[PDB]
Amino acid sequence: SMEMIEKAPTDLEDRDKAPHLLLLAGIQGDEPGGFNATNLFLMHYSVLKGLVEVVPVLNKPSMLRNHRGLYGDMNRKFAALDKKDPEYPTIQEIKSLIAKPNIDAVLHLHDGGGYYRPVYVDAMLNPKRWGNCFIIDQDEVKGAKFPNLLAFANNTIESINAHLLHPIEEYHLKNTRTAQGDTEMQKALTFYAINQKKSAFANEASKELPLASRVFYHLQAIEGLLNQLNIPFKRDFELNPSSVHALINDKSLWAKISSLPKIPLFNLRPRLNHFPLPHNTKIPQIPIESNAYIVGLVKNKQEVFLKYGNKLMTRLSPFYIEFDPSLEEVKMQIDNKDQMVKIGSVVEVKESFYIHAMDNIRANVIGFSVNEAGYTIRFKDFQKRFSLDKQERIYRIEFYKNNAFSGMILVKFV
Ligand SMILES: CC(=O)N[C@@H](C)C(=O)N[C@H](CCC(=O)N[C@@H](CCC[C@@H](N)C(=O)O)C(=O)O)C(=O)O
Ligand code: NA
Ligand code: NA
Ligand SMILES: [Zn+2]
């Protein structure tokens, strides 16, 4: 289930004041440098004129299973393709984005093995390898707004190479001269783009690099190309591997599953038991929201995994149950003060809480034992192993009516 997100200026008229870039990653589901780079771009950059359309992950089902491509190589499906291929509709969506008049340029991100060199050096460094290179299908595309691919590529490479972490990481140009007999690249995404008279580029980050360094180079390539296109932008951080690592591992990231409260992505216990999910609903249909763009759910054996790209954030052991939406709010005393707490919220507790009883609603405070409404509850009353978090501060309160699920509230002890 890929999606397209627009990064555009605040003033809608400014969209036509600079070029339009389509930024794509994750066509292989095991190349996280690309789709963590698109994720950070969406979360932390602003486009001040023009437009950058972003598909953060093209092959989302494969990403969720940490798999190169569950239905084969999606980047060989842009030429001949049987209408019955399982990804045929996804390919049509991708082609439609690429071919729209409102796109000038396309940048396709990949992670690749070893380090490309134009001459054979050794097993890791040679023309067959793909890491740390910037790729075009040909030097010029007649009829594009910016036909000079080579000039753009050379300048983008120069920009990246001004920021090398180690000298082995030096970027080189790879021109696949696709039209001149490269039957594999003839089936891939950027050649389709060139044939729609878009300027098209791919960036490769080496798989020999740690994720933060891969993402660093992908972001250098994006910035280099935006600079060549004269698409002005800002970002809310300094571009170095330390900062990239911090932003990937951002403790403010959350996931909201169905009508449940937001849970933090990071520092969840590895397994969460008896976790309510709506029954008779296929997992890909369960709404899941996040401030990140590469989060989802996927079935694995008898568990449901919460994924952040290729990272496993927790294993849900599901409790499939009817989600009754009639209960909107619950009266709770929080640190002596009565308040109406909405179902699906998180309430911070310094001292204590007390849930007011409701006639046909039963409350289970998970980790508290004696209906558990009508008890004054403090941190020392909790069995800490029932916490959602490694920090042992976040606990679930679940409401039932009374063979159906009426909702959840989280308490966080602060
Ligand atoms: C399909 C394949 O050859 N896989 C292995 C045996 C390999 O040689 N290299 C893999 C994959 C290389 C790769 O997938 N490289 C991309 C480049 C596409 C560039 C451009 N034409 C585009 O559409 O973005 C592609 O072959 O699809 C690696 O580096 O881990
Ligand atoms: Na070198
Ligand atoms: Na399904
Ligand atoms: Zn790839």
UniProtKB/TrEMBL annotation:
Zn(2+) 4 binds at D139, E140. Residues 250-322 form the Carboxypeptidase M99 beta-barrel domain. Zn(2+) 3 binds at H44, D236. SUPFAM superfamilies: Zn-dependent exopeptidases. Transmembrane segments: none annotated. Pfam families: Peptidase_M99, Peptidase_M99_C, Peptidase_M99_m. This is Conserved hypothetical secreted protein. CDD domains: M14_CP_Csd4-like (cd06243). Zn(2+) 6 binds at M340. Residues 5-249 form the D,L-carboxypeptidase peptidase domain. It comes from the Bacteria. GO terms for molecular function: metal ion binding.
